[PDB]
């Protein structure tokens, strides 16, 4: 998910501009739901995932808000000490405590029902147990017991009218989420929200801790520790799931890292390129970043260095010269299925070979498979989510940086060989693989483009539409599932706010029993493809002026 917020000193023809692209995957019907609320203290417009009571994306005429997943480490695993005799108990602070337990029956259509038991300790639900070691693992969340309060914080914050009121609700949101703020006066802010544990000294948060008592968390850190900034010196706030702040530790996921190679740099370069940006240029960052290869920037200098002393007719060098002429933007050919330049295919093959010779080789099986993906891995339907720089590639980037990387290279990943030799060998592998399938004339290589599928199954793999309701888009775009823009104090209108969004395929997913599709089932689908957007209305006048229908209810509680 990404987000850029542009304040007073960077905005052109407005005081503030917020552009948000939450990345949830692509679905039919649409992952988010558009809704305007007017009354009881509320006056809001926007769209939100699964029609939650609180709107994750929108504004209330004075302030606007948006989110990106935070990825802090707020979950730790407690290794609980069991006993072969006295089962259902666990040692905690010198006594044998009984576990909570509940029985569940799974009813099955056209099958027999299944029943099992769920166990819970003071630390959380038991994930797995090791009867050989008499150890059971409990997953402990810092937000446990605060699920409902987090939902309500996301609702109540829609009433805030400034930073002070908004942060009071951000302090109650307990999930690891980045929250963003903009207002009619051109102020902008950011908070990495959530509840984080106050761990005991010497607790390494990447690995399990004994659950017998001495490693128990001390409590939760205060809100004053949550990374946060208001009206930053830079003029803007940008995030693509990168690190909130210097020295802040990331999730403990082995596949997740915040290193020197990070895709947020792709947004930064574009916002730093121009002294000020208009709304139309802020919106245009969606289209550039959507199409940008993420590895080019990272490994082009290494490729250039290693092929610098090669002759004109060495094929390894001609592969690097093709890359050097490319800006990394992928565009479709006229056929709707191949890319105009072969760059991503070359990087993909090179990177898979480089990882197999370096990172993969230093790690024992079967953990070596965690570091082999190049990050281009997809299928015919296309990527299920965003494109990112793979873990293996982030670790390889540190390695090619030499003593300029802050990470001590305890093992030499190049195993005694000069880097340039390993780079050239991988480049030979790349030439062999690609020339075999396409031939030797690089200029007519037509390599396959990634496409995009709006799936009929939701993110859990469960149907939420029939299989024919699947929609296909020829061009894969590394962008939000929805995109929404809010512009405060436009010099070009009399309105204090202007906002736009796009919710594809459409706002309705209704299909009548006779198969008649709602009028708003798919009227946003081509707009999404073309990087278009529709206006969001807030004031009564604007709602009345654009009304297509009205329904009045009289109800009493």
């Amino acid at each position: 998910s990404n987000m850029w917020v542009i304040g007073k000193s960077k905005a052109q023809d407005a005081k503030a501009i917020m552009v948000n692209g939450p990345q949830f995957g692509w679905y039919a019907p649409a992952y988010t739901y558009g809704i305007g609320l007017h009354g009881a203290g509320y006056d809001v417009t926007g769209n939100t995932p699964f029609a939650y009571p609180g709107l994750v994306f929108g504004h209330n005429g004075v302030i606007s808000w948006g989110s990106t997943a935070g990825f802090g480490d707020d979950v730790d695993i407690f290794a609980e000490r069991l006993s072969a005799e006295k089962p259902g108990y666990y040692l905690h602070n010198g006594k044998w405590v009984k576990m909570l337990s509940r029985e569940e029956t799974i009813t099955v259509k056209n099958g027999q029902a299944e029943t099992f038991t769920v166990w819970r300790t003071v630390h959380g639900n038991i994930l797995q147990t090791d009867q050989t070691t008499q150890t059971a693992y409990a997953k402990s969340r810092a937000w446990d017991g605060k699920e409902v309060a987090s939902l309500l914080a996301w609702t109540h914050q829609m009433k805030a009218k400034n930073w002070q009121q908004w942060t009071q609700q951000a302090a109650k949101q307990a999930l690891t989420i980045n929250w963003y703020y903009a207002d009619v006066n051109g102020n902008i802010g950011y908070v990495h929200t959530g509840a984080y544990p106050d761990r005991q000294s010497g607790h390494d948060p990447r690995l399990p801790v004994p659950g017998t008592g001495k490693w128990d968390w001390k409590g939760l850190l205060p809100f004053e520790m949550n990374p946060k900034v208001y009206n930053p010196q830079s003029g803007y706030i940008a995030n693509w799931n990168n690190s909130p702040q210097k020295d802040y530790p990331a999730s403990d996921l082995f596949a997740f890292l915040w290193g020197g190679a990070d895709r947020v740099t792709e947004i930064d370069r574009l916002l730093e390129q121009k002294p000020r940006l208009t709304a139309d240029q802020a919106w245009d960052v969606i289209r550039q970043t959507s199409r940008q290869d993420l590895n080019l920037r990272l490994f082009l200098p290494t490729l250039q260095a290693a092929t610098s002393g090669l002759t004109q007719s060495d094929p390894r060098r001609q592969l690097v010269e093709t890359l050097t002429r490319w800006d990394g933007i992928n565009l479709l050919n006229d056929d709707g299925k191949t890319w105009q330049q072969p760059g991503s295919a070359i990087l993909n093959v090179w990177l898979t070979s480089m990882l197999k010779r370096t990172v993969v080789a230093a790690v024992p099986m079967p953990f070596d498979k965690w570091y082999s993906a190049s990050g281009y891995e997809t299928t015919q339907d296309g990527p299920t989510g965003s494109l990112n720089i793979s873990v293996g590639a982030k670790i390889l980037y540190e390695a090619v940086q030499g003593d300029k990387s802050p990470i001590p290279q305890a093992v030499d990943l190049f195993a005694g060989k000069p880097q340039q030799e390993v780079v050239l060998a991988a480049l030979e592998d790349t030439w062999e693989t690609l020339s075999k399938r396409y031939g030797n004339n690089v200029s007519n290589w037509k390599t396959p483009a990634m496409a995009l599928t709006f799936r009929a199954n939701n993110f859990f793999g469960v149907p939420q539409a029939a299989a024919e309701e699947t929609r296909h888009q020829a061009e894969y775009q590394n962008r939000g599932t929805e995109n929404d823009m809010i512009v405060f104090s436009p010099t070009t209108s009399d309105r204090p706010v202007l906002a736009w969004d796009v919710v594809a395929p459409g706002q309705s997913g209704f299909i009548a029993p006779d198969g008649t599709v709602d009028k708003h089932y798919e009227d946003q689908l081509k707009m999404y493809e073309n990087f278009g957007r529709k206006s969001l209305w807030l004031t009564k006048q604007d709602v009345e002026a654009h009304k297509e229908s009205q329904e009045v209810l009289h109800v009493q509680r």
Partner: protein, 206 residues
């Protein structure tokens, strides 16, 4: 009027709700959600609570068990029982509004029941506050704020220790899964601030 809820849809079909108190407001919201997205909402309700195999069969039994393993329903119900009457109104207004449209649907299915329901062979059931809360828990807290691989981490660490010996095994673990990396690009510039805490990275708990 206090009993009135006005629903205006725009040219893209986006609903605006006009009401004078909380319960009426979110009743309106739930009612248009039931109009627009009933089947999606019912399948998300089954997904977040692990009741998919009841309408879809044996392929979803492991899925259902995994979902129920990953939360504790009584803890959610206790949080709902401690809300104040104004906060409770959000949740129950929303469920009541859904229910009002579901009642009309199950009464006039020939024209109002979403095709999907006939295709998959089952009909919509009524909602309670607990269901609304579980949509958010299931799709927001569980998808984006429940990540850990600490057990796998340990199995990697153990394997590195066997290959490179105890001290160096650890140093290779820190090369692959570092705790922090000072060169990472950050949303907040260093000039403004940095995180104050420092952590152990030697697995000192063993």
């Amino acid at each position: 009027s206090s009993s009135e809820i006005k629903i205006v849809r725009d040219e893209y079909g986006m609903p605006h709700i006009y009401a004078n108190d909380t319960w009426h407001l979110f009743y309106g919201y739930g009612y248009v959600v039931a109009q627009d997205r009933l089947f999606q909402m019912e399948m998300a309700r089954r997904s977040t609570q692990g009741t998919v195999a009841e309408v879809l069969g044996k392929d979803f039994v492991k899925f259902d068990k995994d979902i129920r393993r990953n939360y504790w329903p009584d803890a959610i119900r206790a949080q709902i029982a401690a809300l104040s009457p104004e906060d409770m109104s959000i949740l129950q207004g929303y469920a009541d509004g859904m229910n009002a449209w579901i009642d009309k649907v199950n009464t006039n299915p020939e024209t109002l029941l979403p095709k999907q329901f006939n295709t998959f062979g089952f009909t919509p059931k009524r909602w309670e506050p607990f269901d609304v809360a579980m949509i958010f828990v299931g799709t927001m807290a569980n998808r984006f704020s429940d990540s850990t691989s600490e057990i796998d981490n340990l199995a990697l660490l153990t394997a590195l220790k066997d290959k490179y010996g105890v001290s160096q095994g650890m140093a290779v673990f820190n090369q692959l899964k570092w705790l922090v990396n000072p060169s990472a690009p950050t949303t907040i510039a260093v000039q403004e601030s940095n995180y104050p805490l420092k952590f152990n990275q030697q697995n000192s708990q063993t």
